[PDB]
Amino acid sequence: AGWNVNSKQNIAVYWGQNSANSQSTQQRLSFYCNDANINVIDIAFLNGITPPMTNFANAGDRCTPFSDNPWLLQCPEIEADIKTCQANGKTILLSLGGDSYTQGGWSSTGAAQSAADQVWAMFGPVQSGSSVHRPFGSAVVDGFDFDFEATTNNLAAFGAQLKSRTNAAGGKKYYFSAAPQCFFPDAAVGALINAVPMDWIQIQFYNNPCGVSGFTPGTSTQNNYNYQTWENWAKTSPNPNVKLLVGIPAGPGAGRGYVSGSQLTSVFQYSKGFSTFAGAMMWDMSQLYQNTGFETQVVNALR
């Protein structure tokens, strides 16, 4: 039944950007919704907000741009697949920003609040009184992942307005995650995650010296891998009960600091010792499914 706050074996995986970058490495979203081990999928990315822009790599081939915004896609296959995945018991979030987000956020709190209301009208419940375009039609996401990686002015105000709308909503639970890099504090989402409660934070423990590649097996004194710093911060954050996922590259081509074998098992056994630990995150689905046997290694490390 999707995200499980009481489990230490959650696995969140990004889908949409085809990191593996071959013609066949990213199937449609629902191909990956029969995996008993993957209970959260983040759709990557809404890479523009004001104005809105969607990029789903070659999944875009089965979409049609909206007539008045060529960078915003109408995606009936992703729509159908979100509904299928949710019927199959998966939590499907939309990931906001990503490494190709260049708009730099909003000049005022008011502009950030208006942008949040537009994202909610585009991707949350269908609003009968709204003219906004809906990339996923009558599909409704299960919440939002904040993956901003450059300075994003007034992201805290944007996040607070979107959280206001999800907190007011009926129907189902909406979740909030953020994906800071492991360097502490995080420049891009630091203000957001110090202001707005998250359900979990999926830290990118890669592309940085604090990543899982810097973990020292055989000891619980860790000079580089900084999970402990993140747990200490989490306990006084706006949601003091927020959970952490350990985010890793799903293949050597997915990011710097890929780990496997005993390094991978050991860093997960260390991380499992912490009360905030709730599982793993991986970048990304295309890399994971190409990297034969790697998913089994991660599942076996979390057991």
Residues with catalytic function: 149
Q: Which amino acid is located at 64 in the chain?
A: T
Report yes or no: 100 and 48 within 8 Å, Cβ to Cβ. no
Report yes or no: 35 and 299 within 8 Å, Cβ to Cβ. no
**Number of neighbouring beta carbons within 10 Å of residue 61:** 8
Q: Which among 141, 171, 177, 186 has a CA at the least distance from the CA of 159?
A: 177
